[PDB]
Amino acid sequence: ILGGQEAAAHARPYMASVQVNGTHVCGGTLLDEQWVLSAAHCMDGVTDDDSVQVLLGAHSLSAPEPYKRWYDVQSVVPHPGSRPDSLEDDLILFKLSQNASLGPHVRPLPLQYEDKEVEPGTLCDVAGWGVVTHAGRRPDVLHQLRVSIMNRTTCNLRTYHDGVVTINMMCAESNRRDTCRGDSGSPLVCGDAVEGVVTWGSRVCGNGKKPGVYTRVSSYRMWIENITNG
Alpha carbon distance 165, 135 (integer Å)? 28
Nearest Cα residue to 168 out of 81, 95, 104: 81
* Ramachandran assignment for 3, one of left (phi > 0), alpha (psi -120 to 50 degrees), beta (any other): left
Nearest Cα residue to 184 out of 91, 74, 46, 81: 91
Q: Is 90 a catalytic residue?
A: yes
Catalytic residue among 89, 90, 178, 183: 90
For the chain, the first-to-last Cα distance in angstroms comes to 34
Catalytic residue among 10, 41, 59, 79: 41
Long-range contacts for 156-161 (Cβ within 8 Å, ≥24 apart)?
159/209, 160/209, 160/210, 160/211, 161/210, 161/211, 161/213
Alpha carbon distance 42, 170 (integer Å)? 19
Count of beta carbons in the 10 Å neighbourhood of residue 216: 23
Count of beta carbons in the 10 Å neighbourhood of residue 208: 13
Catalytic residue among 184, 186, 218, 219: 184
The catalytic residue positions are 41, 90, 184
